[PDB]
Amino acid sequence: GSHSMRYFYTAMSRPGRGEPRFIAVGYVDDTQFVRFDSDAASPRTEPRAPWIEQEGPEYWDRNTQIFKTNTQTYRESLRNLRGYYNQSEAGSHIIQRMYGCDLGPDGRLLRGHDQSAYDGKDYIALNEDLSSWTAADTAAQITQRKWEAARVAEQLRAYLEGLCVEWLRRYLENGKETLQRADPPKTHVTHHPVSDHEATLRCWALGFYPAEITLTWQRDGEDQTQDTELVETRPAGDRTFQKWAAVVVPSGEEQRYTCHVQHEGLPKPLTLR
Amino acid sequence: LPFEKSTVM
């Protein structure tokens, strides 16, 4: 797919530090556009992207209302989950939720999704049919029964297919100058000043948006996992990201190797030696 | 725009 809209929720209990904290964050791809934090004295939804600032005070009061409601809902949910697991008021617990809509290159709905976790572990997730739930345990089965009586799946499917897609298209249009613009990486091969028999080959990529990239090192055949140092895609501070790949060569016959890139911002994949 | 149905677990 080309573009996606996602909302990230965190509800955290904290004995001795006040009432449970609720944080809600909205993203269009890798760009944050909305933030709500219940920890403020008078909490309200905040704009986090320039293209969202144009939205009227009605949009902001509607966002503030559901996030104020969710603060209260998740407080009760943490209390109910403590009960299902026979946990006392002593410990700190976290409920996490991630939901959203994925649009294909055509700009149509490819995938609608929703997943919830408890203490960093899968709890309840909406199925691919968007009509049923997968409950990870017996506690999540009690949540499922409540959510079935409340008609959550029907109203969530309708939102994911309708309003989610509709509003993501509005955001993509309003933010077209920064969101529908994909920057390509600056590629180069290097080698660090090492000692004897400690030589290595390092492939680099340094300036890109989106973060999706594929760096592979193969020339004669296909080594794959066989001695290929993979590094996690690390951010820069704007929209920029970074990534590198390595292969061991403790002697001197390294012209027989080739690095390959796959970023979508480039016209076609590059070959590096 | 977020999901506008808040349901207790």
């Epitope: 209260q72 009760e76 009586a149 008609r151 | -």
Partner: T-cell receptor, first 113, second 108 residues
């Protein structure tokens, strides 16, 4: 089911009135509605447990709603006026908004000079 | 952010009656139906979130989100069916908008 008291009430203009609602046990959501003759219920206030999340529908600041323990709710009207004359309905939903609503029989309030 | 339904409808015992409800909203979440007897509590009949037909005994309710309308169909009408029927629109959050109501008169 949801219970309400008193079923009927006649009040003198300027006197205070207290309307009681006892919703279904365990129901998280509580609603208060005003119903005028030949019309549908109009939203007054919303609760989830003890927290009053919205009171945008209250006609005056003379109206005060409470649900201190997150169960029984009271709708208090200070210095009652003739315009306050209506049927006051309370409702409950098991786990939140946009759900099936369970209503009480209401309080039919009439305020006279 | 509104909805419309007929003011009154008269039908004979044993017959059928359809109450139509049209709404206008930008963020629809559900259409529901409630029956209220004079000086009584409104009681839940049916709820339509997605497009389709909800069937509960003699009563049924339909929804067409693209055409912004729904209806309640009462079959094998009885004397006890004489009441006010309210259609209700949910538009996200918790604040439900109820229609003015349709008073049904069942003739013996």
């Amino acid at each position: 089911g949801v219970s309400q008291s008193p079923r009927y009430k006649v009040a003198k203009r300027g006197q205070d009135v207290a309307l009681r609602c006892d919703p279904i046990s365990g129901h998280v959501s509580l609603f208060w509605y005003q119903q005028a003759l030949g019309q549908g219920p109009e939203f007054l206030t919303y609760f989830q447990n003890e927290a009053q999340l919205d009171k945008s529908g209250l006609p005056s600041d003379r109206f005060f709603a409470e649900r201190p323990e997150g169960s029984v709710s009271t709708l208090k009207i200070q210095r009652t006026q003739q315009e306050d004359s209506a049927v006051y309905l309370c409702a409950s939903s098991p786990t939140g908004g946009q759900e099936t609503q369970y209503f009480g029989p209401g309080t039919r309030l009439l305020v006279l000079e | 952010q509104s909805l419309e339904q007929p003011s009154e409808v008269t039908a004979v015992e044993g017959a059928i009656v359809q109450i139509n409800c049209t709404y206008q909203t930008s963020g629809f979440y559900g259409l529901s139906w409630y029956q209220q007897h004079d000086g009584g509590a409104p009681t839940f009949l049916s709820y339509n979130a997605l497009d389709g037909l909800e069937e509960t005994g003699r009563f049924s309710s339909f929804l067409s989100r693209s055409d912004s309308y729904g209806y309640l169909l009462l079959q094998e009408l009885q004397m006890k069916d004489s009441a006010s029927y309210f259609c209700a629109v949910d538009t996200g959050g918790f604040k439900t908008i109820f229609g003015a109501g349709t008073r049904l008169f069942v003739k013996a």
